[PDB]
Structure formats: C-alpha cells, structure tokens
Amino acid sequence: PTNHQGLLSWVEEVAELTQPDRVVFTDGSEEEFQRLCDQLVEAGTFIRLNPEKHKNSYLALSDPSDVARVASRTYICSAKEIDAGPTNNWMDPGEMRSIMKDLYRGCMRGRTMYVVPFCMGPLGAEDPKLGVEITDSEYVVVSMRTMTRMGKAALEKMGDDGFFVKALHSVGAPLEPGQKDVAWPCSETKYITHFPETREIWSYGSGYGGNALLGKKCYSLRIASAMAHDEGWLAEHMLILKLISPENKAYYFAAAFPSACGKTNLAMLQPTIPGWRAETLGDDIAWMRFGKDGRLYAVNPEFGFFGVAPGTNWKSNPNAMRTIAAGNTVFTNVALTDDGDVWWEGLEGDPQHLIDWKGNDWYFRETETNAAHPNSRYCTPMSQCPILAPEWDDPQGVPISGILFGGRRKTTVPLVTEARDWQHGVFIGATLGSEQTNVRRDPMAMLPFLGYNVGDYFQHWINLGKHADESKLPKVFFVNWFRRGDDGRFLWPGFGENSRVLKWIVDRIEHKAGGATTPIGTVPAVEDLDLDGLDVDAADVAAALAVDADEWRQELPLIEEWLQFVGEKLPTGVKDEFDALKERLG
Numbered sequence: 001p002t003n004h005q006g007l008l009s010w011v012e013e014v015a016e017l018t019q020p021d022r023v024v025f026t027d028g029s030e031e032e033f034q035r036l037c038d039q040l041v042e043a044g045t046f047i048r049l050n051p052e053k054h055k056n057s058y059l060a061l062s063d064p065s066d067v068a069r070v071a072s073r074t075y076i077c078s079a080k081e082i083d084a085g086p087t088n089n090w091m092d093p094g095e096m097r098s099i100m101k102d103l104y105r106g107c108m109r110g111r112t113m114y115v116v117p118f119c120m121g122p123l124g125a126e127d128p129k130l131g132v133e134i135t136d137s138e139y140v141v142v143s144m145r146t147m148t149r150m151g152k153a154a155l156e157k158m159g160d161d162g163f164f165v166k167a168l169h170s171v172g173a174p175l176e177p178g179q180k181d182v183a184w185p186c187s188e189t190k191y192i193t194h195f196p197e198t199r200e201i202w203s204y205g206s207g208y209g210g211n212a213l214l215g216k217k218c219y220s221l222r223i224a225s226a227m228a229h230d231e232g233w234l235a236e237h238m239l240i241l242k243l244i245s246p247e248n249k250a251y252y253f254a255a256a257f258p259s260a261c262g263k264t265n266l267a268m269l270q271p272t273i274p275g276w277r278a279e280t281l282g283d284d285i286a287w288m289r290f291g292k293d294g295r296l297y298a299v300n301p302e303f304g305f306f307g308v309a310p311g312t313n314w315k316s317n318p319n320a321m322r323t324i325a326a327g328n329t330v331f332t333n334v335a336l337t338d339d340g341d342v343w344w345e346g347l348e349g350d351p352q353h354l355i356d357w358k359g360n361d362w363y364f365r366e367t368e369t370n371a372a373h374p375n376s377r378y379c380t381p382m383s384q385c386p387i388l389a390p391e392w393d394d395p396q397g398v399p400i401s402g403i404l405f406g407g408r409r410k411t412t413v414p415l416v417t418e419a420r421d422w423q424h425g426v427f428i429g430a431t432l433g434s435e436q437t438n439v440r441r442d443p444m445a446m447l448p449f450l451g452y453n454v455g456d457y458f459q460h461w462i463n464l465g466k467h468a469d470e471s472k473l474p475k476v477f478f479v480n481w482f483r484r485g486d487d488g489r490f491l492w493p494g495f496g497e498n499s500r501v502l503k504w505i506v507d508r509i510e511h512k513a514g515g516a517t518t519p520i521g522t523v524p525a526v527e528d529l530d531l532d533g534l535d536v537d538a539a540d541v542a543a544a545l546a547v548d549a550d551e552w553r554q555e556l557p558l559i560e561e562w563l564q565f566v567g568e569k570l571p572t573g574v575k576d577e578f579d580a581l582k583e584r585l586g
C-alpha cells in the first residue's frame with residue numbers, strides 16, 4: 001500500500017467498484033514469481049513442465065471460448081467517431097463507460113486484485129512510458145512479468161506524481177465465498193476498450209494474449225500510436241533486426257509484416273552468406289524517435305516474446321527454439337508429451353502420443369484434431385535469446401537505416417523494391433497488401449492496432465519525413481518472399497536465403513548496389529543479387545523480380561478502392577503517390 005497518491009486513489013476507486021477479497025501490489029521479484037506460479041499450479045491453471053527440458057516452465061490450457069485476441073470486441077472510444085476512423089470500431093465513450101462500469105461492479109468478488117506496475121522500454125530511460133495494470137488474473141500477472149519490465153523498478157520510476165497509463169482488466173468471473181474456481185476463468189461478454197485522450201485501457205472478459213496482457217498491443221500499439229501522434233514519434237508493429245556485414249559494420253532495420261508472413265523467422269535470421277551475421281532487438285513492436293543527430297532511433301518497448309507456437313521448429317527457426325529451450329516460459333494451449341515436454345504442429349519429433357490442448361489423448365497419424373491450438377503461444381524472456389543484440393536494453397535505442405514492409409503475394413509484387421523517396425515509402429507502407437481468401441490491405445501491418453484515424457496516421461508519417469533531414473531518414477523497402485510461378489513453385493527459397501536480399505538492401509543504403517528504375521520503385525535485376533553458393537534457377541529469380549505493367553494496372557483499382565475506404569482523412573500526399581504510380585505505368 002505504497003504510492004504515489006494518484007495511483008493509490010485510482011486503486012481505491014477501482015477496488016471500491018470491483019470488490020476483490022484483497023489487493024496486492026506486485027514487485028516483479030523472483031520470490032513473487034514462484035509464489036504466483038505455485039498458486040497457479042494449485043488452481044490447475046498451470047502444470048509444471050519437466051524442468052530437465054524447460055527449467056521454471058509451465059503449461060496453461062484455456063477455456064475453448066477464449067483462445068485469441070477478439071477484434072470485433074475491440075474498441076477505440078475517442079470523443080468523436082472520425083478520430084477512430086474506418087479501421088477501428090467506435091462507440092461513444094460515455095455509452096461505453098456506462099456499459100463497462102456496470103460490468104466491473106462486483107466483478108472481482110472472491111478474487112485477489114493485483115496492481116501491476118510496469119515500464120515500456122528500458123528502465124534506464126529518462127521519461128519512460130509507464131503503466132499500471134490492475135487485474136484479477138494471476139496468469140496475467142506472471143505473463144506481464146515476462147512481457148514488460150514489471151514491479152518495483154517501474155513503481156519507483158513513477159515517483160510521487162508521474163504520469164502512467166491506467167490499464168484495467170477483469171476476467172469477469174466473480175466467485176462466491178468458498179466457491180470452487182476453474183482453471184481458466186473468463187466470460188462470454190468481452191470488451192477491449194481504449195480511451196485515447198486519457199491514455200486508458202479497459203478490458204473485460206478474456207484472459208488471453210492481446211486482450212489481457214495490456215502491454216502487448218493495447219499499450220504498445222493502440223495507446224502508444226496516439227501518444228506518438230501527439231508527441232512527434234512512431235509506435236509501430238515492427239521487428240528490429242541488427243545485420244553485421246563482412247566489414248564488421250552494423251545496420252539496423254525495422255520491419256513490418258502482417259501475420260502468416262514468417263516475420264519471426266526473419267527477426268531471428270541465420271544468414272547463409274559468409275561474413276554476414278544477424279542479431280535481434282525484438283520481433284514485434286518498435287518505438288522510433290528522432291535523435292539529436294537527426295536519425296530515427298528504435299527501442300523495443302517489450303521485455304519478452306509472445307510467439308505463435310505452431311510452425312516454430314528447429315529446422316526453420318532454431319534461434320527461437322534455443323530461446324525457448326532455456327526455459328522460464330509459459331506455454332498456452334500447446335500439447336504435453338509423455339515426458340513432460342511440449343509439442344505443437346510443425347515441430348520435429350513425431351511424438352506417438354500426446355495430451356492435446358483440451359486435455360484429451362492424441363495419437364500420431366490417427367487423431368484428426370490439432371494437438372496444439374493453432375493460435376497457441378510461448379511467452380519467454382527476451383534476455384535468453386542466443387542472438388540478442390548487446391544494444392537490446394539501451395534506452396538510447398539504435399539508429400534505423402531501413403524500414404521494410406512485407407506481405408504475402410503470389411503475383412505482381414517483386415521480391416524486393418526500394419522506394420523513390422520518403423513520401424513514396426509512406427505510400428508503400430500505406431498500401432501494404434497481403435493474401436486473404438484476394439488481397440487484404442494492412443497498412444504498416446497496423447490494421448487492427450491503430451489508436452486513431454488511419455488517414456491521420458498516414459499524415460503523421462508524411463509530416464515526420466517532411467520536417468526531417470532527408471539524408472538521415474531510413475530508406476524504405478517492400479519485400480515479398482512468397483511470389484509464385486504459374487505452376488505454383490516458390491520463385492524464391494526464402495528463410496536464411498533472405499539474407500541475400502538484405503545484403504542488397506544494405507548495399508543500396510551504402511550506394512554500392514544498382515537496380516532497375518521501374519514504375520513501382522527500384523528493383524534489382526538477378527545480376528544485382530548475390531546468388532553465389534545458392535542452387536537456384538536464375539530464371540526463377542528473374543521472375544521473382546519482374547515488374548509487369550499489365551499486372552500493376554490491375555493492381556491500381558484495388559489500391560484506389562482501399563484509398564477511398566480510408567475516407568475523408570486520406571492525405572493528399574498519399575493520393576499524389578497513387579497518381580504518380582498510375583502515370584509511370586501508362
């Protein structure tokens with residue numbers, strides 16, 4: 001019962017409303033972490049995994065109704081609907097508060113209310129962005145300890161009157177005295193609400209992932225994008241990659257991809273060409289701000305990895321596997337092996353029997369249901385990653401040389417393209433297309449995560465570049481690892497071989513590589529790429545890099561219909577780039 005009167009007043013007001021059995025301020029210590037884990041094992045929420053294979057690690061199985069972030073229940077409650085905009089779900093904030101305050105009344109009966117102080121980004125910073133999550137979920141507390149810098153240090157940073165993001169959460173499952181709880185409490189009624197003006201997050205009904213770990217997307221992207229809008233910086237859905245060349249020079253890249261585009265594989269790249277090395281500072285969120293020298297510097301505001309498990313394996317991402325191998329991990333909805341290890345679809349091992357994510361027996365080449373839930377997760381400290389860059393915890397961040405945007409496209413979009421200038425780069429991000437069941441637009445990979453109007457967000461990107469030293473700005477590139485030939489072959493082998501594309505990108509930044517001037521930007525010819533040691537058909541690489549005018553003419557009305565959907569706040573500068581592309585295509 002410490003504080004910081006503003007924090008204490010808020011906690012008292014919330015507890016008065018939700019009526020928990022007791023209030024606990026968390027300190028982030030190892031002692032606390034093990035105590036909370038013991039209680040989770042006792043509740044059945046966790047089982048302890050075999051410590052010989054994952055030290056200090058646990059498996060949680062969720063209610064099948066609560067297995068993912070729920071976009072349709074996620075809201076931006078700005079004072080005016082336009083400031084939420086077409087990529088957001090809006091409700092009048094007074095109306096929303098009436099609904100949610102009703103839901104929160106008595107919602108924590110029979111439960112401990114945890115008050116969880118945390119810092120987004122390195123503690124060493126001057127004004128770090130601070131938050132406090134109030135939650136009635138012990139699972140949330142433990143995962144927040146991994147995903148953020150949680151506890152004592154953060155609370156100290158708040159001082160006696162420091163600003164912090166108020167983040168309120170309940171699973172919405174009050175208990176009567178002596179009532180037996182379930183392993184994974186939740187509600188059929190869910191809201192994940194953001195109040196951008198006041199920098200507040202209110203979540204109810206889910207204990208899962210981005211709905212409940214309020215640093216993960218709610219703070220990192222939604223609230224932070226609104227802060228960045230007002231304060232002159234960028235909060236983005238980007239991995240941060242450090243690439244080191246044979247001359248032993250480091251280059252930092254920030255890269256945004258939508259889901260199902262192999263983003264984690266790239267973040268933990270093992271280059272396949274001699275003399276090139278890669279290290280990571282993060283694989284999800286990047287916060288970028290101009291430094292004194294006029295360059296853009298990136299910091300990872302998170303402290304852990306929260307990755308989709310299925311598809312992660314030794315043969316495609318051994319670095320992720322090695323990070324997980326060091327333990328201290330909470331797994332959610334993966335399968336349990338006979339020796340207390342874990343498994344998920346895509347992983348090596350061919351286990352003959354498993355217990356699946358619903359607690360049922362599963363048998364190899366027999367059971368027709370997935371052993372792990374398709375959205376199952378590992379939650380693991382970043383500090384364990386064997387290719388973690390030494391700069392990972394530097395509050396000054398790292399200077400960004402290139403910003404990459406990527407998506408999955410069978411046709412049309414070449415393997416790599418460089419923007420003509422910053423404004424063109426913004427257009428390339430703003431019109432990022434990726435395959436859906438045909439092409440979904442996911443601008444900067446932020447479609448579900450913007451804290452304000454998408455058009456205003458594009459204008460913000462435009463403004464930051466206009467007012468910057470142009471020579472200091474990151475160069476912008478678009479990458480498509482997934483282009484296919486008419487017969488369905490993959491034109492580019494991908495994975496570690498993506499290091500060859502990254503080498504072209506570095507060389508372009510240094511003016512040491514050429515390329516063709518095409519209507520869509522600068523695109524290398526096959527001979528501009530290092531394919532030495534790579535058994536690939538040059539004709540396939542040529543096809544991967546082709547820019548076909550007829551294909552791009554068909555792309556135009558898709559882009560135009562997206563730009564119309566962006567609505568009244570679409571920047572003139574984005575429309576300018578559309579018009580210029582159309583003119584160049586002829």
Ligand SMILES: [Zn+2]
Binds near residue numbers: 259260308
């Ligand atoms: Zn994802």
Ligand SMILES: [Zn+2]
Binds near residue numbers: 237284
């Ligand atoms: Zn992500």
